Structure formats: C-alpha cells, structure tokens
Design a protein around this nucleic acid. Sequence first.
DNA 1: TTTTTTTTTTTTTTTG
Lengths: 66, 66
Amino acid sequence: AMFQIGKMRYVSVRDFKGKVLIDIREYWMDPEGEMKPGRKGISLNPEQWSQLKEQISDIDDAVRKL
Amino acid sequence: AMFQIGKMRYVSVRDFKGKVLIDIREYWMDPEGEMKPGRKGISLNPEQWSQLKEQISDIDDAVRKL
DNA sequence: TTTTTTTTTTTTTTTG
C-alpha cells in the first residue's frame, strides 16, 4: 500500500521477509520509463513508527517555534 | 530540536537556509568520534509532514491488512 | 553515510 505525501514522495506499508516496514521515501523515473525507489528515504520498524507518532505534538511545537 | 525514535534514529526539526525541515534520519559515528547524519533518511517540508500525519489512520490500517 | 524542502535531473535503484 502506498500513500502519497508529495509529488514523488510516499509512505508505504509492506511486509519485508516477515518484518513490517513503514517507508517514507522519494521515487524517481529511470531511463527505461520505470518508477524506482530513490536514495532519499527511510524504512521504519514498528517501534520507530510508534515513537514518531507519539512525538508528533512535540515535533509540531518545534516547527511552530521556528 | 531532535526527537529520538530509535537506537540511532531521530526526527529533527531545524531551519535550513530559511526553510523548515522535518528530517527523519539515521545517524552514525565517524572515525574521529563525531556523531553525524547518515545516508538513510529524508527531509520533509511542512507540507509533506502535514500529508503524512493526515494519512496515519490509513497507514496503520494497511499494516493490519498485511 | 558526511542530511539538508522546492528543482527543470540533482543523476538515486527501499528493506531495524
């Protein structure tokens, strides 16, 4: 499953060899016309995703002060 | 501001060249003993961060439907 | 690894 957050950026959910991964990644279009994952991105495990969500408020507060 | 979400992972909020960035990244330690941002990561603008939050419910649903 | 939005390539090819 893919969820768009930018023109060429998505959050994807997948089971990778038995591990749940939540990837936040940029994608590109290659010379052959194929959509490919980019070097910019990161794949979060369950606990990392859980902690990201738990601190959304603190993250937004930080953004706001900027 | 940095918000830890994993052993070597954080969501950092900073201003870069007058731009607010929400970076989800893995860090590492170099040969001189300095902690540095790593290659695995992605810097989101406030807009992308907003779209990520809006789809958390859908993301978690996809995790369950795996 | 050496971050770093947006980019029109900038030149990648996911996976704790």
